[PDB]
Amino acid sequence: EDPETCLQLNMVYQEVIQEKLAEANLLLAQNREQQEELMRDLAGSYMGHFMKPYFKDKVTGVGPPANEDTREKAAQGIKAFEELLVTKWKNWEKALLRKSVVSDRLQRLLQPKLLKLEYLHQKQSKVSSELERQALEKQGREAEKEIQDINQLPEEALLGNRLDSHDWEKISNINFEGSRSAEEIRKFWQNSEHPSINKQEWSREEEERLQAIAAAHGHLEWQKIAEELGTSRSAFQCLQKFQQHNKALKRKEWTEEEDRMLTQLVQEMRVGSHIPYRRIVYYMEGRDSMQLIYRWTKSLDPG
Amino acid sequence: NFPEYELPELNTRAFHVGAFGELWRGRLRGAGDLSLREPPAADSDREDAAVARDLDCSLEAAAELRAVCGLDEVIPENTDLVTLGVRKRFLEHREETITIDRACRQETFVYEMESHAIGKKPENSADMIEEGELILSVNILYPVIFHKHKEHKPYQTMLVLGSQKLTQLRDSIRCVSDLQIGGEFSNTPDQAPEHISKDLYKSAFFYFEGTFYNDKRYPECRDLSRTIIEWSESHDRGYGKFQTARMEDFTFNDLCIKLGFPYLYCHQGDCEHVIVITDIRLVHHDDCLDRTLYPLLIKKHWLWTRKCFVCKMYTARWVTNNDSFAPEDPCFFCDVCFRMLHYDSEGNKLGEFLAYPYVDPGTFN
Amino acid sequence: YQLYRNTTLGNSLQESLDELIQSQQITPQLALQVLLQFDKAINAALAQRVRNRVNFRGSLNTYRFCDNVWTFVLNDVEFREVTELIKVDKVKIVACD
Amino acid sequence: PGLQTDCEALLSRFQETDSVRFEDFTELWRNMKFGTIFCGRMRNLEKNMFTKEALALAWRYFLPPYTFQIRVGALYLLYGLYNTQLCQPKQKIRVALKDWDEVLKFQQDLVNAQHFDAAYIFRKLRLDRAFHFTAMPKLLSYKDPSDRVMKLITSDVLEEMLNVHDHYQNMKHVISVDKSKPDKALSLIKDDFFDNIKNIVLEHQQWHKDRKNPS
Amino acid sequence: MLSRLQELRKEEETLLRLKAALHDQLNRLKVEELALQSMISSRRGDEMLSSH
Amino acid sequence: SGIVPQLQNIVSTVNLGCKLDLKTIALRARNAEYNPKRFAAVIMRIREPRTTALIFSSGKMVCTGAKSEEQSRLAARKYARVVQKLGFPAKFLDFKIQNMVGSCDVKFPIRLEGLVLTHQQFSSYEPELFPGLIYRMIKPRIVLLIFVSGKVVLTGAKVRAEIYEAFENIYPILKGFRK
Amino acid sequence: MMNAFKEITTMADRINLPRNIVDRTNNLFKQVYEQKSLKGRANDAIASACLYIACRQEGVPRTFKEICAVSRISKKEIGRCFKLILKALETSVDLITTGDFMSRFCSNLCLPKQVQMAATHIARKAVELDLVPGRSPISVAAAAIYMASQASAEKRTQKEIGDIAGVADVTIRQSYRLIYPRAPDLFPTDFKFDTPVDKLP
Amino acid sequence: TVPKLYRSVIEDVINDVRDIFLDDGVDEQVLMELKTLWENKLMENVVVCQYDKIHRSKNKWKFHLKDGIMNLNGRDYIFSKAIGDAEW
DNA sequence: CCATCAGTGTACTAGGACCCGAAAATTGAGTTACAGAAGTAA
DNA sequence: TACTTCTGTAACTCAATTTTCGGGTCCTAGTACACTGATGG
Ligand SMILES: [Zn+2]
Ligand SMILES: [Zn+2]
């Protein structure tokens, strides 16, 4: 009758189809947002990058300079966690130490004579004489004989006497890749791993002699105890053997005051059914975790 | 703001904790869900009426729903499912391979730490937590004490309370670095112990998404973040726009952070811990409701305890360097062995060494 | 090598040897032999006695390369050793390999 | 360790009934003895860990993009699992903020659809305070999905479209000044819109079936 | 995780096909509306020949 | 189109007019490098024009890196003055711009395969050796590196007008091969 | 002029390529020796370039890395002499397509013929869909081979495919991530497999 | 650390030249007084080093130094490896 | 009957190679000058 | 004995390729520590 009805129906149809199009476009936008999330999942990426140097450069890899508080703490000699970190000495490490010390001594004993031979050769090059040249040749032959003698030196005489200064810092870098400090290597070589330290198993007679010497001489001069023991032993080894065979190390008898202390400590440091006895021990004097476990399980248990 | 995955399953976009808590409390406002009360024929009628009003159903329909939807151990287990079958096979294997069949020390320790304070009512009724307090299940990564800490990172998790002033978690984080005793006691070990590091160096600061909250509460405290800010202000380090705060005028409720993202907590000069907020949740009625002790250690790693190198019965009360007797340069001794090995008769040090007081990380942390 | 005979150690060795020469207690040939031995010893020690990494940032003012020696001059430089900072206005780096 | 398989099997056996009543879920629970899933010797630590895993899996299945039947089945699964626990401090279902809108609208739809069983189950879960209203579904450190085609096009949408189209044809027939033929300026309407959308949807479902059919 | 990726991308292709069909429908509707405007203008032009 | 290439490098040569002792220049210059075991020229760098000059014992200097002809000439004169202050009779004779390297972006991906197919006699496209198509334009002796990203690099020209005309000639072809 | 045909024959034998290609290579070598537009280049490099040109021309193109592995020179000189010969001879070679290296790459590997056809179709559709713009056809072939092997019963890691096609595993990953989301639509419609194409690394 | 390295270097040099001192005809007392004089006298910023790799970007210089002794602010330091960056 | 003293069941260490991916850096071609050494080729 | 190529340096472009750099990754092997299980005077 009049296309105005065509217009009304037509833009209402366009409105409904446009609502449908808008809903579909919102679904498409959500899908593309999901896809972006998924690609950033593919492009996503640890805890280790923060641990000690939380702030660190991406070009040099070093964190901020130490705080003045850190400097003051270091001045007071408060050992850091890495300074108190202790690692066991492996057997291959011991063999590497031995070989490195031997090579170090060989190099240190060879460098002087080698340099002397080089100087003799240099003088021979410009001597402007013959008889003096023959004398220099004889001196060079003597130097070469000395070098050969040094080269064929036995290991026993080459190792030293556990008190001579070797290049322990070089061993920490060339021989060892930096896993051991110079002082650690020096102490381990001098006190423990030197061949002049008797590492053989103790004998009953040796143990009895050690006990008698500790009793008579006192348990406070273990250096003199090791020296007087006769056998080549370190004071640390003698003290260790005495302690492992001692009987006064632990009190060996419970008292009412000690029982009260143990009960108080347990009640203070309990978290339920978990009773950490190792942590309890160190407020007790001369006690072991096994003793506390037995005491609290058999006698002091309220049940 | 709404917490959403910034990374697929690893991180969330930075959002204000206050807005998140306000949203949660407004969506549960007056719904009878945030109660914090202990669980409790006449009540049946009231329950039926409530069901009818909430579900737009008749009273008889509500009664039918209540009666029909009711709830619907014993060691034997038969007619097993796949998972129940796996459990049965595992139990049989454990029985045939184990002789004691008890909870290991680590398992009991972890369970007791997790459940140490659950449902513990306050003794005063004045420290009761409000209905909805935005508990943060924070975790503090242990420092590198032993070498293997670099490979696998142990952490201690603490249920910090929302709307709780900072410096209440800093004073609660138990680290051995605060108990360090400075100085060298080689000459005589009977010196009066110097004030623990907790007293000498009170400074510390949190760092949460480019904002250094410094612990300037005490006069002995001074800005540790100043060094970091100056270091960043230098030529160029990517980091920039560092902010600063006081750490006592801010609360965990006013913090804008991410979940699962490593933030920093520095104290005692350079002792750094990684703070990670695992999740944030409203306070329930089956967990601790106290405020005096809510900065609660939910889990700790139970570190190893160093032993005297002479005798393996006691821990290390002293650490000696440059020792003329020890095999290792850093050597650990207890009081007894240290005294017997390092002093002749009255405290005169024998040989040469540098002895320091050592506090066992596995005992005080 | 004629590189490490410019620092405090090498300089002081140079004046000590000169003081012996003017004192008629040592000959110049031994002086130069000792100098070469010191060069070898310091090279070996530094290459094998030292393990510590430094990182320096600056604005390179000038540089120069000739006969296998680099001569950098940097301004407003900061060195970072293991843990400490060393800030200087100007520094000269003489490298040779 | 096989828990997901049990959950999937229970949900499949619930959906194959094409029912929403809690009676069918209770019958399946009693027949499968699913209440004994927690039975078995296991100390408190691993017990609560397994309960946490079960509740998290059930809640994940309760949320989209799963079908309505699967979602309601997972709701009953959550109810049964939480109500039947061996842990004294009953583990709570972790609910995120972003998912609260979906759960609330799902409950509103359930009550609207006269599915009073599921609505009452959810109300009982809420009243018992079995929900830990966390920030994210899981702690952060360091199937029968639903398609968008049904939301786009379905029976009612196409019925309305064809009704509009035929009404449009009628008003075209009546608009023209002459009843014999319509005007030549309006003849661009497409009759293949329904055919085109039917082709698209049939191709989509053909792809879906040849996908879920193994090679 | 490619299962959901492929499901989502296939749904994406299907819904792009639906948008293409609906956009063609909208374009033809707008062309029809332009024709409507033109012919209504022409037809209404037949009765302003007698006005005040 | 309305886009024109922007010059990135300008290589020019000059004759100083006197033999030079490269060792003296290396030892007395401020930023010179002299490695006779690697090359037979002194490499000097300056900041104001940001250019690098290779100075040869024969007295011929090659300046590169300048972004404009005037900048290149100023840099060459600066190097000549620097050499003059070192006690050499250096002059400024026979200054010539030897190469002009410019870059541009047509801002649409290009189908290299079709371009090489229809321009086999000019283009050389070897993905194994270089990911870019090498078009040897013939009217001006210019070489164009054309990439799928739309970036076009023109090289080998002695004058800026040569680069501009080469880009004008190449643009219609790229538009016809708009990916 | 001699000692080059023998060297060409040795190179061809090391590849087990047919004699017609060898005759074409000899003809190209004789030609380039007649123009002498590249006299300064070594005879071995010219022979390698001629062999590459002949292989490309006959329709069984090889890669520069597959001629370097046979010749005594590096890929740089092979490419330089290839360009020089194409310039001097005033001839041209059709651009290599990703389907040319499919048969040889999948025959060197123990992949079945079905996997070969699947990889060829994947690569052709990927290049048609512009999923790998401006990337060498060899990398696209390697990525297609990898996806076809991972989806098929016989699986191959990136290392073996890189060795066979002479493409670094990093390049394989880069060319694989671009076509990663579009894995299914690239596969043949009628393709049987035991490991679903719906899940892949 | 620097004083320890200097002392070690002095000891090594003395031990190496003791043979020449003995041979050429100068008593070891001259050697001892040389050591004492060197040690006693041991008590512009210049870095003498060796270059492992001097990389030059467009304007960024990256220095990799094998070893060196530096004289910063009148204080001597030693490094066995330097990774430095600069902008010309 | 209160102490003993190997075994015990774990997580927690200790070394010990070993891998995974990202970022930076390099190579490679295109031009053109320039001087001198290498590198065959004849 | 000629007669070539091949070094740098510059400068943008892009892909390919290598390098290397911090951290993880997995696996075997002791290690700590509460508890048990007799065990003996
Ligand atoms: Zn701490
Ligand atoms: Zn002890």
Numbering used by the authors:
A (entry chain c): 81 to 125, 141 to 398
B (entry chain b): 28 to 67, 76 to 107, 119 to 411
C (entry chain V): 3 to 99
D (entry chain a): 5 to 146, 162 to 234
E (entry chain d): 1 to 52
F (entry chain O): 159 to 337
G (entry chain M): 114 to 314
H (entry chain U): 9 to 51, 332 to 376
Paper text:
Transcription initiation of snRNA genes relies on a specific factor called snRNA-activating protein complex (SNAPc). SNAPc binds a DNA motif in the upstream region of snRNA promoters, referred to as the proximal sequence element (PSE). The core of SNAPc binds two turns of DNA and recognizes the snRNA promoter-specific proximal sequence element (PSE), located upstream of the TATA box-binding protein TBP. Two extensions of SNAPc, called wing-1 and wing-2, bind TFIIA and TFIIB, respectively, explaining how SNAPc directs Pol II to snRNA promoters.
The local map enabled building of an atomic model for SNAPc and PSE-containing upstream DNA. The high-resolution structure of the SNAPc-core bound to the U5 promoter shows how the subunits SNAPC1, SNAPC3 and SNAPC4 fold and interact. Whereas wing-1 of SNAPc binds to TFIIA, wing-2 binds TFIIB. SNAPc interaction with TFIIA and TFIIB involves three interfaces that we call A, B and C. In interface A, the wing-1 of SNAPC4 (helices α4 and α5) slides under the four-helix bundle of TFIIA like a wedge, stabilizing the flexible bundle region. Interface C is formed between wing-2 and the C-terminal cyclin fold of the TFIIB core. Although biochemical studies had identified SNAPC3 and SNAPC4 as poor DNA binders when investigated in isolation, our results suggest that formation of the SNAPc complex with its intricate interactions between these two subunits enables tight binding of the PSE, which explains how SNAPc recognizes the snRNA promoter.
